[PDB]
């Protein structure tokens with residue numbers, strides 16, 4: 001049972017720096033780091049590449065603010081347009097972030113809607129901040145939105161909205 | 173240039189039988205099989221870098237980064253007169269999200285791949301601007317689905333594509349999506365559109 005949401009030697013300096021800043025944020029308990037594990041042959045999609053090759057990320061959650069931040073570094077195996085991250089790898093990390101935000105707020109959910117605007121392409125081996133927030137809850141409906149930005153927060157790469165439906169275990 | 177859109181021992185009978193059916197559809201010439209590779213063909217890399225975007229590898233196509241059967245297994249067939257691209261897709265165990273089912277991002281990925289390849293046939297080098305997915309029913313691991321996309325309208329550099337994700341018998345609708353793709357303006361050119 002290995003935790004992948006901790007620094008390894010594939011991590012760019014920018015990702016290490018940001019991770020350290022968010023670990024400091026965790027000092028008073030207002031933020032908290034989420035461990036992540038690999039998982040027949042079935043494995044978690046975002047944790048199925050070797051180190052550095054696929055998704056490298058850590059999530060930090062702020063309960064008071066119902067906010068999830070994903071620090072994310074995309075490896076060479078996530079390529080779409082030459083030199084950039086595939087639009088589906090972006091959707092994947094968006095979904096994993098906004099979904100985990102809903103799940104920390106309110107428990108088990110599944111994505112019903114995912115609406116992504118790609119504003120600027122993301123360079124392969126770059127590091128981004130996915131910042132999501134729970135906007136409103138309406139019964140079983142969780143409305144989470146987010147944005148993907150450069151580490152320095154100058155560049156806006158993507159914006160997304162999403163709807164998660166809390167499952168009713170007495171039905172599934 | 174090894175073609176990954178051909179049958180291999182991981183392809184279950186439904187993927188294999190549905191490949192044969194679309195291969196039959198290709199005989200009259202109305203449909204055509206697309207190849208797919210682990211890496212973009214060097215002609216398109218050259219074109220892309222030299223005229224559009226170069227950010228200054230082990231690089232390989234996201235959808236083709238899994239060994240046989242574990243990830244995305246797929247083939248695309250295109251109909252030019254219908255402006256319609258169909259992807260036959262089988263999702264392996266490494267695509268798991270909810271236990272037993274394909275991750276929403278791996279569904280988004282195969283949707284993006286399909287609608288994106290549809291936009292490219294009509295528009296050349298394009299990139300995703302919007303991708304709007306409704307996930308209606310969960311897709312079980314190792315199931316074979318069809319992604320059916322069509323180009324709905326072209327307006328300047330805008331290509332609007334729709335699609336559906338369906339079971340082989342078409343009775344179960346897993347997902348539906350809409351999308352906007354945008355034909356890239358070369359880096360050294362003006363557009364010269366409104367704005």
Ligand SMILES: CCCCCCCCC[C@@H](O)CSCCNC(=O)CCNC(=O)[C@H](O)C(C)(C)COP(=O)(O)OP(=O)(O)OC[C@H]1O[C@@H](n2cnc3c(N)ncnc32)[C@H](O)[C@@H]1OP(=O)(O)O
Nearest residue numbers: 080081086087117118119120121122212299300301302354
């Ligand atoms: C052969 C095998 C190879 C395999 C291939 C392998 C892999 C395949 C690769 C795959 O992985 C798929 S690429 C997947 C990842 N995609 C991206 O990263 C795209 C990032 N975005 C951009 O680079 C730019 O934003 C883009 C180039 C898209 C547009 O940038 P520009 O060109 O500068 O566009 P303008 O800003 O002048 O806007 C143009 C018009 O569009 C409108 N518009 C724009 N965005 C919109 C939105 N989100 N909703 C609604 N509308 C939107 C806008 O209002 C305007 O309309 P008007 O206002 O009516 O004029």
Ligand SMILES: CCCCCCCCC[C@@H](O)CSCCNC(=O)CCNC(=O)[C@H](O)C(C)(C)COP(=O)(O)OP(=O)(O)OC[C@H]1O[C@@H](n2cnc3c(N)ncnc32)[C@H](O)[C@@H]1OP(=O)(O)O
Nearest residue numbers: 099110111112113165269270275276306307308309310311
């Ligand atoms: C699982 C553990 C996580 C693992 C960790 C991995 C994590 C990675 C995460 C990824 O893996 C992602 S989870 C994997 C990807 N997700 C899926 O495949 C979900 C497929 N969908 C479904 O199973 C069902 O549609 C769902 C369970 C979503 C809802 O099924 P039901 O329970 O039958 O709910 P109802 O259908 O009665 O509708 C409920 C309400 O929502 C409204 N609505 C529904 N869809 C809508 C849409 N698209 N737009 C707008 N609205 C929509 C609807 O109008 C209704 O509203 P009201 O009638 O006004 O109340």
